[PDB]
């Protein structure tokens, strides 16, 4: 009946029990255990009180290693004696030795082959690194095996750059300089990464295409699948990740040219040479990859549960999250999975006493997310014609605890106000904030870089289940979790990310002993969904969108102004974008005034206003999409092409301007820049006009 009862019903012990339940056997996507977990989720959600729980199923292309023929990178002498063999598997965590179906580390969707060649260190395999090798360092990676280090970019971009350079194979490894927090013991006696720990993950470049074999349509039973040779974003060279305990052996013999800069150098006790091949003593020795992993179409299952809306059942508020894991997923994703389970239980125990939400709530335990966001993307593809007209908002719930320091929220500007209000009502679990709101602790620990007194809220990027809903469909999204101290630790992710050591004991001891942080994240997501699907008027504010639009326009304008002579010569102008932003600001002000003054009693008018608020986000979607990326259609927040995961807003103009001084034809590039400016200005003006008077 009240949000306070819902928030008080959530308990940390239930989170602990659900996490324990979900983190005891492997739950890799496409396996039998994942199917059994899906059945358990269905049964428990049915018992909790959900109106209807279903197991949607699809047949998507996954990748598995050959259990008969394990993958391993070797070093071969002149006669190919394989003097050094890499580790076949990482040592199991204590108490999990008898557990079976622990897949060895592998890069999903890597092709086969037995490539031979010399080694070239490429630092983080970024575009800038390859630029430094070829333009400055005079190194031709073509025909050589490329070895990189995890961090600062996505694995897919690493493999794509290595492919463009012409390499034969890719070896990824985790340096202690990026995944070993100082003063922290390894997993058996801490939360740091040991030498055997290997990070997993796909290496695909689907650009939000979902199933590689069915671009644009769901992979149901009556589906036509293209040839793998014609599949979308499939790597063409073998890739296999190792731990630093083996990369040290790979790089100790490395010789040739010196490292370009101390930035390239890591923490391993190796010269970190870049020069192809080993030193003079071992120049004849080469590195041979042994990858025999295969691809196969297998069946994945998403669990979809429905809580029908009392007043507006057609408007769906979705609480997503995925269930597939790599080995045990003590954090990714079973922390979010347990939080979702407890939120569903609280919703059900409120429903069993007569309560019903004003709007329909769709809960979703996705699948095969670690394989390219396949399950959620295919489900959204199947139900796109419904979600585009009925999807109020989407709330993603992936791994909840990243560190015990402070909250972290990534959401659309339409939710910022709501994000603040709920955070003021909740309590802060952090130390030095007993009897204090989560708002003040979040603000002090994470001040906004621009404003003062407001907490920092980052942008919504990609790489999770919100991607299909936000970047293509255009549904307002939001994620909240707990993370590390942003300005101090200075290492990417967490040391045991996507590893066999991501067990339950890790969460229970070194990340959340009392589950108060999990409880707080559960309260945040649950109250967010509650206020989203229960408020009379949708808690959306467009003034925040206007402000951030002006900020993004200024940033892109400065990036363009970096080339004043070129813009003067080709008459590149940004006046249209600024006029569009100003008109958006004025129209948003008028619409907000109308929201403040309107009769809420009349249901038709309230439906009109809430529809306007709903479709404001959808107005930014470009039907044609970004160039070469038809499935990225968000004009403002779509991922960038070149410098993705670090890119700027207005991805079209930003991508057009990227490395524009290296183009052979400046006129064509600046014409493309003008075209993207035109597209952005028209999109902003149209999204503003959707808030104008309705005839």
């Amino acid at each position, epitope marked *: 009946h009240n949000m306070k009862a819902f928030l008080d019903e959530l308990k940390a012990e239930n989170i602990k029990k659900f996490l324990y339940n979900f983190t005891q056997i492997p739950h890799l996507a496409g396996t039998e255990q994942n199917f059994q977990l899906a059945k358990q989720i269905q049964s428990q959600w049915k018992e909790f009180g959900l109106d209807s729980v279903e197991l949607a199923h699809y047949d998507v292309l996954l990748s598995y290693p050959n259990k008969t023929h394990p993958n391993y990178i070797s070093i071969i*002498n002149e*006669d190919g*004696n394989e*003097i*050094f*063999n*890499t*580790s*076949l*598997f*990482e*040592p*199991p965590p*204590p108490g999990y*030795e008898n557990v079976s179906d622990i897949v060895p580390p592998f890069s999903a969707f890597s092709p086969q082959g037995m490539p031979e060649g010399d080694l070239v260190y490429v630092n983080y395999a970024r575009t800038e690194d390859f630029f430094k090798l070829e333009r400055d360092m005079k190194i031709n990676c073509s025909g050589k095996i490329v070895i990189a280090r995890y961090g600062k970019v996505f694995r897919g971009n690493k493999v794509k750059n290595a492919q463009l350079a012409g390499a034969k194979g890719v070896i990824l490894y985790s340096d202690p300089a990026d995944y070993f927090a100082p003063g922290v013991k390894s997993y058996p006696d801490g939360w740091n990464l040991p*030498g*055997g720990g290997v990070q997993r993950g796909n290496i695909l470049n689907l650009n939000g295409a979902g199933d590689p074999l069915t671009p644009g349509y769901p992979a149901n039973e009556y589906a036509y699948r293209r040839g793998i040779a014609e599949a979308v974003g499939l790597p063409s060279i073998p890739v296999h990740p190792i731990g630093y*305990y*083996d990369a040290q*052996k790979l790089l100790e013999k490395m010789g040739g040219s010196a490292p370009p800069d101390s930035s390239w150098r890591g923490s391993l006790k190796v010269p970190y040479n870049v020069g192809p091949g080993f030193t003079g003593n*071992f120049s004849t020795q080469k590195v041979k990859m042994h990858i025999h992993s295969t691809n196969e179409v297998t069946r994945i299952y998403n669990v979809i549960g429905t809580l029908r809306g009392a007043v507006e059942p057609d408007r769906y508020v979705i609480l997503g999250g995925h269930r597939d894991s790599w080995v045990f997923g003590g954090i990714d994703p079973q922390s979010g999975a347990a939080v979702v389970h407890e939120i569903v239980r609280s919703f059900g125990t409120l429903k069993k006493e007569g309560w019903r939400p004003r709007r329909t709530i769709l809960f979703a335990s996705w699948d095969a997310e670690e394989f390219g966001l396949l399950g959620s993307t295919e489900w959204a593809e199947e139900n796109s014609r419904l979600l585009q007209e009925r999807g109020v908002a989407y709330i993603n719930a992936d791994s909840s605890i990243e560190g015990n320091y402070t909250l972290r929220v990534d959401c659309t500007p339409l939710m910022y106000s709501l994000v603040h209000n709920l955070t003021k009502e909740l309590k802060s679990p952090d130390e030095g904030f007993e009897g204090k709101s989560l708002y003040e602790s979040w603000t002090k620990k994470s001040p906004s870089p621009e404003f003062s007194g407001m907490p920092r809220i980052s942008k919504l990027g990609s790489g999770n289940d919100f991607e299909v809903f936000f970047q293509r469909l255009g549904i307002a999204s939001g994620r909240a979790r707990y993370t590390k101290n942003w300005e101090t630790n200075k290492f990417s992710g967490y040391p045991l990310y996507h590893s066999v050591y991501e067990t339950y004991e890790l969460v229970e001891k070194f990340y959340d002993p009392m589950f108060k942080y999990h409880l707080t994240v559960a309260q945040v997501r649950g109250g967010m969904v509650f206020e989203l699907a229960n408020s009379i008027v949708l808690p959306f504010d467009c003034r925040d969108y206007a402000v951030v639009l002006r900020k993004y326009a200024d940033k892109i304008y400065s990036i363009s102004m970096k080339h004043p002579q070129e813009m003067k010569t080709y008459s590149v102008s940004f006046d249209s974008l600024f006029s569009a932003v100003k008109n958006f600001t004025e129209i948003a002000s008028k619409f907000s005034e109308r929201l403040q003054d309107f009769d809420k009693s009349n249901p038709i008018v309230l439906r009109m206003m809430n529809d306007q608020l709903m479709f404001l986000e959808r107005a930014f979607i470009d039907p044609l999409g970004l160039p070469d990326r038809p499935f990225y259609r968000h004009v403002i927040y779509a991922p960038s092409s070149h410098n993705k995961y670090a890119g700027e807003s207005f991805p079209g103009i930003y991508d057009a301007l990227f490395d524009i001084e290296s183009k052979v034809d400046p006129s064509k590039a600046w014409g493309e820049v003008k075209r993207q400016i035109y597209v952005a200005a028209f999109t902003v003006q149209a999204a503003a006009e959707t808030l104008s008077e309705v005839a």
Partner: nanobody
Amino acid sequence: QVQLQESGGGSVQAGGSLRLSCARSGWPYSTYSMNWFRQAPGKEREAVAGISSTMSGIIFAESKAGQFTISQDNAKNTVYLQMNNLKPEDTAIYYCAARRDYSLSSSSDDFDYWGQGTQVTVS
């Protein structure tokens, strides 16, 4: 306690092949890695080849990599080392060296539990 019982010694003329197999009895730790050290009668102690519980191995004697190979089975908790085309300079004493860390190193100081040793003579 842990006992590295060594066996498989012999005295075969040049060109022969010897098998040096040793078990790992009483090892309580979950993770292990051990190495086959060779000491000449008139020289110091040097590593030859190491293996780990992670099914990773290396031969440090790159000059005679073809002659020497290393294999293990965790079912028997046993490791074998195979000779090819033995030569007179191979006459030496071979020790086991086992340690907790699942790494491979040529340093004899990093190993605490040492094997009995085995004489190998090649004429």
